[PDB]
Amino acid sequence: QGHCEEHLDPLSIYCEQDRALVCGVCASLGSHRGHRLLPAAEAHARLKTQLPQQKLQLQEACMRKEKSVAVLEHQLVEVEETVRQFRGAVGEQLGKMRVFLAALEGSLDREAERVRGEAGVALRRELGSLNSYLEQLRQMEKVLEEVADKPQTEFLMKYCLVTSRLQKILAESPPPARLDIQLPIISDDFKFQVWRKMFRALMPALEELTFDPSSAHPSLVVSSSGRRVECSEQKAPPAGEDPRQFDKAVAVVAHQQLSEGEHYWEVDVGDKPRWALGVIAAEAPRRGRLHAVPSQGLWLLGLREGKILEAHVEKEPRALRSPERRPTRIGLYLSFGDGVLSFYDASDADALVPLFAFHERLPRPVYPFFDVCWHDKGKNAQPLLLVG
C-alpha cells in the first residue's frame, strides 16, 4: 500500500519531530501541520548513514540491560549468603551455651553413676555375706532335725559343733544399715547456679598471651615461661634504644597484636595492692609518665591501696564501688565489632561480676598493657601472672 490511512495519499513526507512517515495531506491540514519536515527521499538517505549509529545505540541499550540483570543475579546469591551467614552465626553463638549445658549435665551424670555403682556394689557384697549366713543356718536346722534320734556318741559331737558354730555366727553378724547416698543437692537455686556459670562459658578461649621483655621497664623481669612479670628491688640499667621500652611507666605490653574480633584474657593479681591492666594503642607513646586516658591511647583500669578501684576515663578517674571481697583475678573482654572493653572480677569463675566497660569505637590495633608499678621500697613486690 505505502499510502495514508486517514487520507490515502502516498507517504512521501517524514516528520522530524514525531519521527513517523506521513502523506501529503497530513503535512497540509493534519496533526503534522506545523512540524519540521523532510521528503521521504532525504529522510531515507539521512537514515541509511545513521543506521550503524542506531545499531550501536541498541547495543549500548542491550549492554545496560545485561549489566543490570548481572547485578540482580549477584544479589540473588548475596541473599542466600547473607541468610546463611546469619542463620549460621546464630547457631554458633547458641552452640556455646548448648555445649556448656551438655558438658555440665555429663559431669553430673558421671557423678550420678560413680555414687550409683560404688554405693551399689558395697551392698551386693554385704548381700553375699547374708546369703552365706542364711545358707549356713539352713544346714544347721537340717543337722538339728536329724540329731534328735542319733546314738550317744554321734549326737553329742554334732550338737557341740552346731552350738559352737552358731555361737561364732552371732558375734560376726552386723546390724543392717540404712541407705545413705550423697548425690549433689538439686535446689531451686540450681537453674540459677548454672546460668551464672554460663557467663564464663560465653567468652572466647583465653588469648595466647606472653609479655614482651623487649618492651619491659628495666626494673621489670619477665619469667622464662613468658607469663610472669615482677618489679625487682635492684638497680635498673635504663635503655633508651627503643621507644617501645618503658622508662617512667614501670610497665610491659604483650607480644601479641590485637586487630579484629573478640578476645578474652584473665590476669591473676593476687594480693598485689597497686597495679593497672588494660590495652594500649599501638602507636601511642610509651616514653615518659603518661596520663592514663583513651585520648592519649590508654584504655586503663587501675587499683590503689588494694581496696579502691578506678577507671582511667576521659584527669580525675572514676572510683568504682569496690567489690565486697578484694578481687584475686581480673578478666578483660575485648570486641572490636562492638567497640567494648569489659573488666570482670574473675576470682570466682562460676560467678563473674563486671566492674566496668568502655563503650567506644576503638582504634585498631592494640597491645595488652600491664602496669606493674614501682616495688615501692619492698611493699609492691607481688608479681603479675597470666592465667592460661
Next chain:
Amino acid sequence: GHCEEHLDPLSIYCEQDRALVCGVCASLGSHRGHRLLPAAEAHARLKTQLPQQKLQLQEACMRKEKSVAVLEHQLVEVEETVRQFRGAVGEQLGKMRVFLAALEGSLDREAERVRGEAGVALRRELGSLNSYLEQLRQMEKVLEEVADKPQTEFLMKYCLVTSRLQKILAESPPPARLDIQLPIISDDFKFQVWRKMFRALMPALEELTFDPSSAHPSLVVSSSGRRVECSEQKAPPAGEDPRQFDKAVAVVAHQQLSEGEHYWEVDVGDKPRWALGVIAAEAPRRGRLHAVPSQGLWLLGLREGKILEAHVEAKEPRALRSPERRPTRIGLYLSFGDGVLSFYDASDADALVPLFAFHERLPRPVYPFFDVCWHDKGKNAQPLLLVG
C-alpha cells in the same frame, strides 16, 4: 567311737571346752582341771535344750532373712533415687534448652521470611528486565534485516523500531542495591540472649488477686482483683477485724504462700512512693507499722520517685544504689527452700536487674504485701497493677 590320742571311750563331757573327751583326757592335762560331766547326763540335758535351741536357731534365722530383704529393697531404692536425680537435672537444664531452641526457631523463621521475600522481589524485576532485553535484541535483528530495503518499508520499520526503543528507555531504572533487614548479629548476641534467659528461668507468674478485705478503707480494688489505687473518697474511718490495715495504706493478696518457688511482677509506673514485698501471715497489720523483718515485713520501698530503700533490720532503712532509669515494674522471687526474697527492676524483661534480696529462713506462710501509700492530695495517685 573312741578318743584319737588313746583308745578310751568318750563318756566324759567338758563344760568349759564344750567338747566330749575320754577318761584319760580328763586325767591328762589337756582337759584335767576343767569342770566335767558324764556323757549320759549331758545327753539328757541337751535333749531338753533341743526345743529351746531350735527356737534360737530360727530366731536369728528369721531376722537375717528380713535383713536380706531390707538390703534387697535398697538395691532398687538406689536405682530410683539416681533416676530422680538424672531426671531432675534434665528438667531444670531443659528449661534453658527449650528457651534456646525456641529463640532459634523464631529467628530461623524471620530469616526464612526475609529470604523468600527478597527471593521473589528479584526474580520479578529480573524477569521483567529479560523481556525488555529479549525485545531489545529482537530490534537489532530488525535493524540488520531492513538496511537494504525500499524506501517506504525501510522508513516505517525505522519508525517502529525507534519508537519501541523510545518506550523501553523510559521504563527501567539503574541497577540499585540489595536491601535486606536482618537482625544484626554482633559479638554481643550471646550476651543479650543470656540476659534474656534469666527471666525465662522464673516460674509462671503467680495467680494473685488483691484481697479487698485486707484493704485500707481509702483504697479501691478494681479489674478482677488486679488493680488497686488510693482514691480521695469518703473513707469509713476503720474496720474492726485485725486483717484490715487501718493506718498504713496497704493491701495483701488473697493468696497464701507456704512452700516452693514464686515469681510475681508489679507494674508501678511513675508512682513516686510505694512499698512492695511480703508480710508474715499472723504478723500485725494494725497501727503504724515499723518496716523490719523481725515484725514480719519484707519490703523494698521507693521515696521521692528516685530513691529506693531496703527495709532491713535497722533504725534507718538501707539506701539502695538507684539505677539510672526509673523502675516501672518490679519483680519478686521467692523460695522457702533456699530462704530468699529477691527484688528486681523488671522494667525490661530481656534484662532484669537485681535490686536487693533478703537471705533468711522465711516464716511460713506469707502474704504478698502492697503499700500503696497515701494519695497525697493528688501527687501519689498512681495505681499498683499486677501483671499477668
